[PDB]
Amino acid sequence: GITGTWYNQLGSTFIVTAGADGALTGTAESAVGNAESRYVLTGRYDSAPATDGSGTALGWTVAWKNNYRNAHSATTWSGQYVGGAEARINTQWLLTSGTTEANAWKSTLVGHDTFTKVKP
Amino acid sequence: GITGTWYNQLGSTFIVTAGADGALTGTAENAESRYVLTGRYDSAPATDGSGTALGWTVAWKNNYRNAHSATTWSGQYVGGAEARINTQWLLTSGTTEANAWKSTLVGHDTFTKV
Amino acid sequence: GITGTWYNQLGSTFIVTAGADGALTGTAESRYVLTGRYDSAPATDGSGTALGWTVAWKNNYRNAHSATTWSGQYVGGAEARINTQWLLTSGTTEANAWKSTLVGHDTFTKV
Amino acid sequence: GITGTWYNQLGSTFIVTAGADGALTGTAESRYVLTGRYDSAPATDGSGTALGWTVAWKNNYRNAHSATTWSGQYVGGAEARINTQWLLTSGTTEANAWKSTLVGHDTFTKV
Numbered sequence A: 001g002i003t004g005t006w007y008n009q010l011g012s013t014f015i016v017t018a019g020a021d022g023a024l025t026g027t028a029e030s031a032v033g034n035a036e037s038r039y040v041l042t043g044r045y046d047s048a049p050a051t052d053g054s055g056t057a058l059g060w061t062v063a064w065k066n067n068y069r070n071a072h073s074a075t076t077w078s079g080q081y082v083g084g085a086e087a088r089i090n091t092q093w094l095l096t097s098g099t100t101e102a103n104a105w106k107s108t109l110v111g112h113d114t115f116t117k118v119k120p
Numbered sequence B: 001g002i003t004g005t006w007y008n009q010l011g012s013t014f015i016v017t018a019g020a021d022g023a024l025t026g027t028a029e030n031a032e033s034r035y036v037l038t039g040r041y042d043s044a045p046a047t048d049g050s051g052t053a054l055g056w057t058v059a060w061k062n063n064y065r066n067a068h069s070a071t072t073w074s075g076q077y078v079g080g081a082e083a084r085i086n087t088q089w090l091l092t093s094g095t096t097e098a099n100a101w102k103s104t105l106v107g108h109d110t111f112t113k114v
Numbered sequence C, D: 001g002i003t004g005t006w007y008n009q010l011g012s013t014f015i016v017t018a019g020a021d022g023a024l025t026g027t028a029e030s031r032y033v034l035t036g037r038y039d040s041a042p043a044t045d046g047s048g049t050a051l052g053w054t055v056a057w058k059n060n061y062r063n064a065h066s067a068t069t070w071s072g073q074y075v076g077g078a079e080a081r082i083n084t085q086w087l088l089t090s091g092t093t094e095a096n097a098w099k100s101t102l103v104g105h106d107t108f109t110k111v
């Protein structure tokens, strides 16, 4: 279900493997910002969701440092997986950059990403 | 300065180990209230007195309990004698499509070594 | 371009009046009053027009002890829309304040 | 209660008037107009009073092409406070929309 290759509305590709113990591992490649190539993704999911047709809660993080670039920032996505003919993951994200004390009021961006198993 | 025990303003206790290549692993917490954490951090931060960007996730499921939800914390570690982690968090619960609009809470937490 | 009737994704109807001094007044449809501000002198370079508004969910008939604020921008053009993120806060006791605030997003269109 | 002069943790000054059926009006300060709403009939059980307001960062001297909304609750008591979370959106292009909005939190007191 969650395991597979996902794309957000921006071209980004996230390759995610769901483990049997609630672990989420994989790789992100962003189509925007200060990023190049692949970045390590790690997260957790609810490995035994409700019966009742509710979604599957999950979250993951990417720190935007790899061997090519370092953006001194990290993003966390929080959302739910919803099965169906068109499986989708709906998330909200927080992106925090490292700042000095004086600039911390403006260190965090917030947005929403919708992931699909079909590239837009 | 990150590896160790951190406490938030709620009493809760977080034990985190920060690996050499940017992994964060540990637990949030008796057994029944203990949960797994996994995250990532900037292992090569700037020198300019900037904070170290990081983030982590906890799904609220263990062997004993399952709240069908996950929290992510996004934030930065600040050093010194008043070492702190300042974060904002998102908590999402699994919902039906009908109730998705109220699936996510937002808030902030501050973690201290004491 | 902002003044008029707007519809978000779950059919709610917002009637918005943009005043020349930057004020936004109108109603969200039971029916509640809205009030906000917008940039009454945006850039002409394709940038959007920044805005925000608030609805407290109390009227003559019902009270939910909560308020929502929408923060976003207007984008004009053939398919004008207002893209927003929102925060919904409910009155809670001090000990439930951690769970007093929801976050989401809303898109408004003219049809 | 809510009417008065409020200061946030960074020292900015908000002068707020609470109107009879839930209007918030006032200024933030370099001085800008604020507008919002609040629950004029809060719960008696000890809960806080839900509210929100907006400031568009345009006045007669400067315009940053951006707007902030605060969502939160007023807590009466020893330290009357207003605990909020805020969103600041800047007018951007289509291409830069994904990075248009910052989020944070603010505590206000009369001290």
Ligand SMILES: N=C1N[C@H]2[C@H](CS[C@H]2CCCCC(=O)O)N1
Binding pocket: A008, A010, A012, A030, A031, A032, A033, A034, A035, A064, A071, A073, A075, A093, A095, A111, A113, D098
């Ligand atoms: N796929 C996505 N890319 C952007 C959003 C949220 S994370 C962001 C990319 C940031 C890359 C590093 C940076 O620019 O600081 N979703």
